[PDB]
Design a protein around this nucleic acid. Structure first.
Ligand code: ZN
Ligand code: ZN
Ligand code: ZN
Ligand code: ZN
Ligand code: ZN
Lengths: 182, 368, 321, 20, 506
DNA sequence: TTTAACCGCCAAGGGG
DNA sequence: CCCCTTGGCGGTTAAAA
């Protein structure tokens, strides 16, 4: 099924791929704008402008389902090989406190954006109907337009060398060795 | 000058072999010892045996995990170590042999003891050829090295002196010793190396240092087959300006045999006298020094060069004839004390060196 | 004490090929022939110095990344997984020590009664229809799939005809890459390589090879450069592709604030556009000299000259008034 | 190339007037 | 002036694709994007070759931390690594933020090593075998010493002994015997002594073998250019290379009369080359019986006419110009090459001979046991017999074919210390010189050109039409495509100047 | 598509 | 003893992939 991602978000995704795989950089976690925060802001800002009741409950259902699906599939199909060691570090750090792992409160705005790129390849191997998939595609498109609206604050260009709060952090020889060699 | 010269040599630094075809053998050090003992230089130097270092002194620069790994790793228990091997780069390039920890401890202890003797004032020249592993960086073996005993040396020298100058003339860039002092303005590093697609990979011209140690790191990139009349011409002005303007208190000099002509891995065309001119010019300043010995993978050359250097340090010019050491057969057809250059073509044009000097001097004009 | 006699398996092999106890190896004999006291004074003249100031202290590739390395293989399904390429990431030190089955095998054993599977999914759906149900199918099914490394979905990449996947899956772009007198000859025009900086080729001579200079011929605009004219130590053969100082930065840090040039898109999706003011029109660095966000301005070259002048005038008016 | 000449003549006269 | 800078830049860069980049950079600056410093740097790399326009740009614009390219920066999280001995000053001077890790600085590609010939590889293998023998023997010796100190005590530095006992008892019974020793010392001591004896015997024999192998390879190993030489001279001493060199010099000078220049300080080198040429001509079975004398007379006349050295002593052993075609130019270049090589050889000859005659030997064991008696039995060791003359005699021998090239090269290497590798092709270069003289003789047009040169040279008192009519006559003898070379020589100082007038006579 | 046969060019030496 | 006989090597090119 055809999905129309804006060109800026495609550029951002390509930049993420290049940063992670070529320059060996990984994400700075926990992100200061996480998946939960962006989804909640989207829901709060759109719901106050739409008055119809059904299209307002369906938005909340879509947001909750997106949160659950992100949580259930991040540790499966959203991380490169290099980023799995940091994922293991986070998992074991959480495992020391008998706590659960909530990626929506750690990752943000760039693993959700990369989450909605395989949806055409995720829906295809299912048993759903047609008019239900169309609604999902439409909702993802509205969410993408809203994300493109606030793109000058979720993806800003800052270098790891010059800023500690930058969206990406450099890795070390030991971490990269264990990741890409073990 | 007429300096009081100490000399450190452990009688066990030669009994620790790497892999079979591995180009790094410390046997050369023991060979050099014979060249120093049969030449009658024992009557002019105070030979000591530095006490081997312990974990609490290696961990001054290195980390607890790395040092703890080194002290337990063994060829016997290697297959039970699968994470630290790939993490710490202790695999094939830096192999694990039978006496790794003892060799590293001897190398560290020699450098630290020489630095201490310089500190108290017993000697004003320290020579420890076992140490000089200028590659290891705080968490990983790199280029045949496992413990950066040099950095321990500068730490001990800093415990007394306001400033230290570390000159490196090994063909490979001193990444390990430049990294540990990339930020501070106390230690000033100056490395002459081959820049290209060569092993260190680092050492670009514009690596003046970051943060508080800006303009306190000098890199001299050189091409294939440099010779004495060129290496001296590039060496002398830079060190002259450094010691006139930076004004160090002590000085460490890394005398590696990798720059010698016909070395197994190097690509320079320095003769024995071309190498010795650097040590002459460094000693020509009067400040206390701790000469170490790094690379060099042709023993018949590095042993001769190190013996000639230790003779020159004692203000004597040694005989060009060999005194019939134990390892006579190693020393070639004529059995002299000399390293002969090859006819390889020198690719270092004067214009490139002139530009390098202009950049380096312009950088240093703000280091009173 | 009566230990076993000797080591009959004494000499096995050495570096010389021979067992180190036999000697010449006569074949090598014929191959490699033609036809002030001693050190023992070191034991006593060594004084132990310890005055330190610190003295007192199945498949050969992972089924997730398609790469080789450490493998935790399975038995029910002939597949292989990295210890890290696994959900959850498991540590090689604490091996499960037991039958390890992939998620697909776990489902096929625990669930896959070929007909009853519908019932199972049905049950999940009917405990999620009242709640979020658009994602119910995906939420149920992704518990039956194996972990994978995340690759772009084969169509985001194709939006840019300047990127390509490397060997294992890496990023790759348009910058990935004794006496030789022939390097100064084009071989297509019979002319020399007049360097931009010095305007000379400096071939030297065969009789005097110490007057020639190495030349570069930049890999983007094909202009020749001496290695000495632009300070540089050696040729670029292995790493990235060399680019001479006659190119635009494509990345700018102004004091901070970053500027970057956009990427290359397929010409069908490229929206070219031309302005009308022709004097003052704030554009980015995306110009051409002669989804609607990547518009490259056609800058009308005579404008650039104008776009220069008054700016300098303005830069004067700041410091002259 | 004449518009540039006239515009810059006018602007230089204006700048001289502002810097008399 | 200031309203014409863009035209000047357009004519200076002289390219359209690079002018596009220049305009892009100017726009980048114009949009507040680029700063003033990087703009100045780019205009320095574009127009900085001129000392006039770039300065105008500089004063018109009113121009009047910096990280390196090889160090990354880790976040503060990777600062907290436990160092159980790091003191306060160590925290103060050390650095845990910036790391290089060459693999990052190598662009993940790899490293290019240095090239080593097979002789160096043979030396490395010999060194490896020597090291293995010495290491095992020394380990056994140290363990033997310790065991002796133990046994003499019991009659009434932690891994050496274990390793050596494991090596000796390789049947995997060593682990038990080590602890049995810790709780049997004399028997393992005597077994170690026996093993040491056999190892030392084998090492003596292998020392013999290694000495024999090394004595024929060491000097070859230090010969880097000499091994490739005599193959590169084949493809680098043609006519096309010389024309390429002279044209390159002309082209370089045409962006700013005497393109080439040579100086002939010595005289007897001419006689040396003549002796070599006559020896080769006498030996060679490739010409006619009168042709040999014809070639000899041609060479003698050319030498005694161009340089006016002597018309008779050659058999006892006002600036002049010369217009030439390719044949005469290549012949003169061959002559200049031979003269240059022999002058380089003869310049250092006094110090070379002084070094050879003072070559002392070591008497501790060298003269007692082992000597290199291969280059001395054939007299190719320059004992006395001043090195330049011996080199000439050996060159004549090799030209006559009674000396294989191997021993000539070996003697030259051992006498001149790889400083005379460029004499490996004396025979072939003399053969090429003779062939070029023959081709110069057997060409009608070339013969006419040399006839004109002879007339002009012997005239020695010409008119104001000297150059023009001579050039016109030679060009009439020549075609309308081949190049022209003006070779001049002044008897005052023996200096030869070459100008490359390819087609400038028209 | 490239890379080894393949004929010229050279020089050392084993042995019949 | 002298000639195959070996041993290598470089530009062309046609042949196996
Ligand atoms: Zn080195
Ligand atoms: Zn994997
Ligand atoms: Zn399975
Ligand atoms: Zn140039
Ligand atoms: Zn370019």
């Amino acid at each position: 099924i055809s999905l129309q991602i804006p060109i800026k978000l495609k550029s951002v995704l390509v930049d993420d791929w290049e940063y992670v795989t070529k320059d060996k950089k990984i994400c700075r976690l926990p992100a200061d704008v996480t998946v939960e925060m962006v989804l909640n802001k989207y829901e709060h800002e759109v719901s106050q402008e739409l008055e119809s009741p059904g299209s307002q409950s369906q938005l909340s259902e879509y947001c909750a389902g997106l949160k659950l699906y992100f949580d259930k599939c991040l540790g499966n199909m959203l991380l490169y090989r290099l980023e799995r060691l940091q994922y293991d570090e986070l998992l074991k750090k959480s495992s020391k406190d008998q706590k659960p792992l909530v990626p929506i409160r750690i990752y943000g705005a760039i693993h959700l954006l990369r989450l909605i790129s395989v949806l055409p390849e995720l829906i295809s191997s299912t048993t759903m109907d047609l008019q239900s998939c169309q609604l999902l595609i439409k909702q993802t498109e509205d969410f993408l337009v809203w994300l493109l609206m606030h793109v000058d604050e979720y993806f800003n260009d800052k270098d790891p060398n010059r800023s500690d709060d930058a969206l990406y952090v450099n890795t070390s020889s030991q971490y990269e060795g264990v990741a890409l060699g073990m | 000058d007429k300096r009081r010269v100490a000399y450190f040599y452990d009688a066990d630094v030669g009994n620790y072999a790497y892999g079979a075809g591995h180009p790094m053998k410390p046997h050369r050090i023991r060979m050099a010892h014979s060249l120093i003992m049969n030449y009658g230089l024992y009557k002019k130097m105070e030979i000591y045996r530095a006490k081997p270092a312990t974990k609490q002194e290696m961990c001054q620069f290195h980390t607890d995990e790395y040092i703890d790994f080194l002290s337990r790793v063994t060829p016997d228990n290697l297959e039970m170590f699968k994470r630290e091997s790939v993490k710490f780069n202790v695999g094939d390039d830096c192999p694990v042999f039978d006496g790794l920890y003892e060799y590293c401890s001897i190398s560290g202890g020699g450098s630290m003891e020489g630095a201490a003797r310089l500190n108290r004032g017993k000697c004003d020249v320290a020579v420890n050829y076992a140490g000089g592993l200028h590659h290891a960086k705080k968490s990983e073996a790199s280029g045949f090295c496992y413990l950066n005993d040099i950095v321990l040396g500068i730490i001990e020298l800093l415990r007394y002196h306001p400033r230290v100058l570390y000159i490196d003339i090994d063909v490979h860039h001193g990444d390990g010793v430049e990294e540990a002092f990339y930020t501070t303005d106390r230690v000033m590093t100056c490395s002459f190396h081959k820049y290209g697609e060569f092993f260190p990979g680092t050492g670009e011209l514009r690596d003046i240092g970051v943060g508080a140690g800006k303009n306190y790191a000098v890199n001299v990139p050189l091409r294939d087959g440099i010779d004495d009349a060129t290496y001296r011409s590039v060496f002398e002005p830079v060190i002259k300006k450094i010691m006139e303007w930076y004004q160090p208190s002590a000085v460490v000099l890394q005398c590696g045999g990798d720059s010698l002509s016909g070395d197994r891995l190097g690509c320079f065309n320095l003769s024995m006298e071309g190498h010795a001119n650097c040590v002459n010019y460094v000693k020509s300043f009067g400040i206390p020094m701790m000469v170490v010995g790094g690379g060099g993978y042709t023993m018949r050359n590095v042993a001769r060069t190190w013996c000639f250097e230790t003779g020159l340090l004692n203000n004597v010019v040694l005989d060009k004839d060999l005194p019939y050491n134990e390892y006579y057969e190693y020393y070639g057809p004529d059995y002299k004390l000399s390293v002969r250059p090859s006819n390889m073509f020198n690719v270092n044009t004067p214009e490139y060196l002139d530009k390098v000097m202009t950049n380096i001097f312009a950088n240093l004009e703000n280091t009173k | 004490l009566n230990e076993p006699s000797t080591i009959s398996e004494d000499s096995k092999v050495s570096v010389t090929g021979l067992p180190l106890n036999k000697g010449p190896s006569e074949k090598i004999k014929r191959e490699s022939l033609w036809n002030d006291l001693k050190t023992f004074l070191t034991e006593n003249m060594t004084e132990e110095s310890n005055i330190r100031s610190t003295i007192g202290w199945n498949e050969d590739f992972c089924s997730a990344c398609n790469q080789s390395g450490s493998f935790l293989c399975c038995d029910t399904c002939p597949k292989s997984f990295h210890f890290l390429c696994l959900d959850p990431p498991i540590d090689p030190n604490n091996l499960p020590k037991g039958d390890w089955h992939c998620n697909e095998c776990k489902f096929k054993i625990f669930i896959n009664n070929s007909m009853a599977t519908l019932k199972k999914i049905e049950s999940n759906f009917i405990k999620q229809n009242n709640n979020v149900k658009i994602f119910a199918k995906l939420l149920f099914n992704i518990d039956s799939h194996n972990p994978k490394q995340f690759q772009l979905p084969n169509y985001i990449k194709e939006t840019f005809p300047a990127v390509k996947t490397g060997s294992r899956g890496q990023y790759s772009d348009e910058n990935d890459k004794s006496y030789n007198p022939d390097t100064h000859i084009d071989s297509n025009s019979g002319k020399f390589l007049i360097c931009y900086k010095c305007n000379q080729t400096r071939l030297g001579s065969w009789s005097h090879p110490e007057n020639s200079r190495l030349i570069m011929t930049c890999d983007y605009c094909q202009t020749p450069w001496h290695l000495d004219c632009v300070p540089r130590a050696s040729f670029k053969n292995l790493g990235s592709k060399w680019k001479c100082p006659l190119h635009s930065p494509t990345k700018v840090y102004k004091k901070y604030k970053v500027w970057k040039k956009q990427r290359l898109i397929n010409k069908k999706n490229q929206l070219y556009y031309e302005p009308l003011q022709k004097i003052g029109y704030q554009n980015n660095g995306n110009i051409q000299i002669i989804n609607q966000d990547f518009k490259i301005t056609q800058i009308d070259e005579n404008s650039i000259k104008y776009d220069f002048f008054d700016k300098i005038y303005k830069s004067k008016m700041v410091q002259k008034r | 190339n004449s518009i540039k000449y006239d515009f810059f003549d006018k602007i230089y006269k204006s700048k001289m007037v502002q810097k008399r | 002036e200031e309203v014409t800078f863009f035209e000047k830049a357009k004519r200076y860069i002289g390219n359209k694709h690079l002018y596009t980049e220049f305009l892009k950079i100017l726009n980048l600056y114009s949009q507040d994007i680029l700063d003033l410093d990087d703009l100045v740097e780019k205009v320095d790399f574009y127009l900085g070759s001129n000392k006039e326009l770039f300065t105008w740009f500089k004063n018109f614009v009113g121009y009047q931390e910096a990280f390196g390219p090889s160090y990354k920066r880790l976040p503060k999280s990777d600062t907290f690594m436990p160092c159980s001995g790091r003191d306060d000053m160590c925290w103060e001077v050390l650095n845990d933020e910036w790391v290089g890790h060459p693999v990052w600085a190598s662009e993940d590609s790899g490293f290019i090593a240095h090239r080593k010939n097979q002789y160096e590889e043979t030396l490395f293998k010999i060194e490896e075998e020597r090291h293995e023998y010495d290491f095992y023997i020394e380990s056994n010796l140290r363990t033997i010493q310790c065991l002796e100190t133990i046994v003499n005590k019991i009659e009434n530095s932690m891994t050496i002994y274990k390793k050596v006992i494991r090596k000796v008892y390789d049947k995997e019974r060593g682990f038990e015997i080590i602890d049995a020793l810790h709780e049997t010392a004399p028997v393992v001591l005597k077994r170690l002594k026996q093993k040491d004896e056999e190892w030392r015997r084998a090492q003596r024999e292998w020392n013999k073998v290694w000495r024999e192998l090394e004595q024929k390879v060491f000097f070859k190993s230090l010969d880097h250019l000499g091994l490739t030489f005599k193959q590169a001279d084949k493809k680098l001493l043609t006519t096309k290379q010389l024309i390429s060199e002279i044209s390159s010099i002309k082209v370089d000078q045409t962006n700013k009369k005497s393109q080439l220049d040579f100086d002939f300080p010595d005289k007897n080198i001419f006689y040396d080359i003549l002796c070599l040429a006559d020896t080769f001509i006498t030996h060679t079975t490739a010409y006619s019986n009168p042709d040999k004398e014809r070639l000899k007379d041609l060479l003698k006349y050319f030498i005694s006419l161009f340089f006016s050295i002597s018309f008779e002593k050659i058999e006892e052993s006002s600036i002049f110009n010369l217009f030439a075609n390719t044949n005469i130019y290549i012949f003169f270049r061959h002559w200049t090459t031979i003269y240059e090589r022999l002058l380089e050889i003869k310049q250092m000859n006094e110090r070379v001979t002084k070094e050879i005659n003072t070559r002392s030997t070591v008497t501790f064991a060298k003269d007692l046991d082992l000597l290199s008696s291969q280059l001395s039995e054939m007299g190719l060791d320059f004992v006395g017999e001043d090195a330049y003359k011996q080199v000439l005699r050996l060159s004549r021998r090799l030209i006559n074919g009674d000396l294989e090239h191997q021993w000539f090269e070996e003697s030259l290497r051992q006498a001149y210390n790889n400083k005379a590798f460029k004499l490996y092709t004396i025979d072939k270069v003399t053969q090429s010189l003779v062939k070029h003289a023959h081709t110069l003789m057997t060409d009608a047009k070339t013969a006419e050109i040399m006839a004109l040169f002879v007339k002009d040279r012997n005239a020695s008192t010409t008119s104001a039409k000297d150059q023009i009519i001579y050039r016109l006559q030679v060009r009439s003898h020549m075609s309308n495509t081949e190049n022209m070379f003006r070779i001049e020589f002044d008897k005052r100082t023996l200096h030869v100047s070459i100008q490359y007038i390819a087609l400038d006579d028209l």
